[PDB]
Amino acid sequence: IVGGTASVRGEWPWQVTLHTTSPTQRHLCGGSIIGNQWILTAAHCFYGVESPKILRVYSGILNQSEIKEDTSFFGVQEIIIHDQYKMAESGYDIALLKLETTVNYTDSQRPISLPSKGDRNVIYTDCWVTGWGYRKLRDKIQNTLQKAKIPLVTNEECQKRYRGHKITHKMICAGYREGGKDACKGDSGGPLSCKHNEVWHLVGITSWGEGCAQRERPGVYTNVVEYVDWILEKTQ
Ligand SMILES: [O-][n+]1cc(-c2c(-n3cnnn3)ccc(Cl)c2F)ccc1[C@@H](CC1CC1)n1cc(-c2c(F)cncc2Cl)cn1
Structure with a gap:
């Protein structure tokens, strides 16, 4: 992180x-x-x-x-x-x-609960990424589990940042426009956890990104709600 x-x-x-x-x-x-x-x-x-x-x-x-x-x-x-x-x-x-x-x-x-049936159009404003990964691109696995609050990005904005990839509705992106907070090496597979009505939901799975916490390059997460049936x- x-x-x-x-x-x-x-x-x-x-x-x-x-x-x-x-x-x-x-x-x-x-x-x-x-x-x-x-x-x-x-x-x-x-x-x-x-x-x-x-x-x-x-x-x-x-x-x-x-x-x-x-x-x-x-x-x-x-x-x-x-x-x-x-x-x-x-x-x-x-x-x-x-x-x-x-x-x-x-x-x-x-x-942690899966995204709930009937919550498809909830705007999650309290989302956190957690892990033992690098604190920067060339770093090391961390001893203590780290946390960071990160805002969700629309898929439209995310696609504009990743014009060489297909950003689909089965992905969700998260990050600051200025960068500085993101997942990094060793965080993948962990949760993007969002709290709604004081209940935590597994909204994303940490997946990939261009670099770590770079400006205008949000992290990309598996959009868990689209896989609930699976x-x-x-x-x-
Ligand atoms: O974890 N992880 C995170 C991102 C990522 C990035 N990154 C882009 N460039 N780096 N990260 C940006 C945003 C988001 Cl959302 C991301 F999920 C991308 C890839 C990975 C994983 C894949 C690998 C498990 C298959 N990985 C782990 C290590 C690693 C290591 F190096 C040293 N010791 C132990 C480990 Cl396990 C290297 N790779």
Whole structure:
């Protein structure tokens, strides 16, 4: 996260850190708890992941340094990538992780709601991006989960900033015209979380952008409301 600040324990309890263990253990992507056995993340995360065997899902983590050899994690039973996914910039950047067992929800590990049926024309004005990613283009993965408030951009404006890409209704963009706050390397797969009527909704999945927090180059997120039917089909 560029231009963000440290979170405190329990502040984003749907946020998980997805680790790979091949050839060594490290943070790979963010993700969001959406059900007791379900994580929503980005399809692009699994480029070069040979199978679910090497994945570990950690919940309730504030600092990456908390994770040691006896820290409990969830195994991944299945990776479900959208059938039309080809590359992040061309959309369909969405994946479900089915966990091997059910998360018991606690103060540190909680689900986030999907965008609600009948909220298609809500204007979300309280949106946040969170993650352990770089604070700038050439940086490092952060120990403490970071947060930043970022405004949504219309798809019309976003397309004008990305005339070499097809910005579709299945994407949502977010960023300041002057730049300075954005996701960056290591944040992808995590949530764009928006609060409406004091309930948090998983509005976006951190996906791609040109650079990090550059002027007039918003971050691009998978528009989760356009995939609710797909999510419900796979999770039922
Ligand atoms: O995370 N992430 C974020 C953006 C992004 C950008 N960026 C544009 N240029 N950089 N970021 C801008 C806006 C938005 Cl919304 C974005 F989602 C683009 C790509 C990525 C991911 C893909 C990769 C998982 C498949 N990634 C993670 C690392 C990485 C690393 F480098 C060092 N150690 C550990 C890690 Cl996991 C590198 N890439």
